[PDB]
Amino acid sequence: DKVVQAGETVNDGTLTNHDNQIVFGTANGMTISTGLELGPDSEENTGGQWIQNGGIAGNTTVTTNGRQVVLEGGTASDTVIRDGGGQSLNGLAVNTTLNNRGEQWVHEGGVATGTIINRDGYQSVKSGGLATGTIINTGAEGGPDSDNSYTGQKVQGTAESTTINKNGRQIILFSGLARDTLIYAGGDQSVHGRALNTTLNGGYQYVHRDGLALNTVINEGGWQVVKAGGAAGNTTINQNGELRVHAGGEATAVTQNTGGALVTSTAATVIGTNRLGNFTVENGKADGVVLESGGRLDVLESHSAQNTLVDDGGTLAVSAGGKATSVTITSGGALIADSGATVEGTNASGKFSIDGTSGQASGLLLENGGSFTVNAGGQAGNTTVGHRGTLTLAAGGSLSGRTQLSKGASMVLNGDVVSTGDIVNAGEIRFDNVTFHKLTTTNLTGQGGTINMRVRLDGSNASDQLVINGGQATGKTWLAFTNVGNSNLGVATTGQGIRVVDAQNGATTEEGAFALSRPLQAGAFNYTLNRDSDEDWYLRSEN
Ligand SMILES: [Mg+2]
């Protein structure tokens, strides 16, 4: 048991085999490799280096099993804690570096400045301690879904001037404060206490139940997530940043700049000012919201929205029972709703309305992930489905006027449908749900575009079916059949065949109107699509 007394500099050496070194003067260049054999969580340990009040340790290396205890008024310079060593800090530590399960506990009254947490190292600031000028490079390599709180920085006290690099993680517990942080892309900070003055230069900030975040700026690639029961105030959403406010979250004094994404629901609280004026999402009522660049507003059941602008890259999602009036969707805006929602506004091509009370819609335009669902007994008129838009019809839906499908458009049919107007398909219609449906239209105009249909080639003469009611089938439209019966079994067709397009009440079809997209064989037969004199089209057997 060496005792370095005051003004007696010890200037190299090691420490082993549960031996203590009591420092009252100066002890440079030590190797502490004893005292922590039993693990950080036991008062059963003997050995290590103990810097007393007024003592100094410079360029110590605490390696596996080594324990360095700095008491009140001691100091530890340029310390390397690695490979499962630890430092218990009640005084001053300057320029510590933590590698591979090296730990630093800064207990009440302790102060650590310049700690670099390098990989699988850990700095725990117990309540009443202070960490200043920390660099965190680890803790967050498992992604936003990693629940790792065992490496990185955990604060129960206070952390000032922290830089969080890729893979770095800061957890602020209930009692904790983190003031002035810069969080780069790949790194994150989890806030359960107080985070104040945070710069997300592509970094992530999670604000959980009972966490307060004040003065966060979200630059490009950054993310502020306010969970239920968390609260953020005075956030600035710069271009290509997003603020996420969950049901039960507080977002007050939000500055949504141009290019800023806002993702929230009427079940949260978001007050602020965007590039068009003031906005409020409060108590189930949103007024003035501007969804762009990945922003989403969900108007849940029995809430309301007015003066919403859905711009290119934004999404308005109105649940059934929600209302949203004076909507303006610019070309490239997405609208998700069904015939039980109530929406009014204007889109890229004029006025539109969904009246959830009667279940009739008129003039929709579904682009870029927009979607509408016509529920049972509903009716959508003059629909325009664009690239990446979807129109789904529940069993018992109706169409009215001209249903136009642009290239890249989807229309899914989950049961029998009647259009009392014109379907114009340049995209893809698809009979899905194993029951077979009938799509009745007055006129079909094919502009390319497959209708994906289903067939049983197993002795049934059973299939999906198109019906031209009184009108005409023109253009060119591809038919894609899938055999849903017993495969490798093919039965012969009987007489005229499986009727797939039925012309009725005087309907005519043109002669190159329909065409098999790919061959249809089952078992020993090739199934061929043939138009006859009755204007109807049939599936028949080959050789
Ligand atoms: Mg701990």
Author numbering: 2 to 434, 453 to 562
Tell me, in the authors' exact words, what the paper reports.
Ag43 possesses a modular domain organisation that is common throughout the ATs, which encompasses an N-terminal signal sequence that directs the secretion of the protein across the inner membrane, a passenger (α) domain that is responsible for the function of the protein, and a C-terminal translocator (β) domain that facilitates the translocation of the functional α-domain to the cell surface. After translocation, the Ag43 α-domain (α43) is cleaved but remains attached to the cell via non-covalent interactions.
Present within the structures of α43_UTI89 and α43_EDL933, their AC regions consist of three β-strand rungs capped by a β-hairpin motif. The first superposition predicted an α43_EDL933 functional dimer stabilised by two interfaces, each consisting of 12 hydrogen bonds. Conversely, when the α43_UTI89 functional dimer was used as the scaffold, α43_EDL933 molecules were predicted to self-associate via one interface also encompassing 24 hydrogen bonds. We generated a second mutant where we mutated T199 and T256 to glycine at the base of α43_EDL-933 (Ag43EDL933-mt-double), mapping far from the predicted single interface, and responsible for 10 out of the total predicted 24 hydrogen bonds stabilising the putative Ag43EDL933 double interface dimer. Examination of MS528 strains expressing these mutants in cell-aggregation assays showed that while modification of the predicted Ag43EDL933 single interface did not alter its aggregative function, mutation of two residues in the double interface completely abolished Ag43EDL933 mediated cell aggregation. Hence, we confirmed that α43_EDL933 interacts via an extensive double interface.
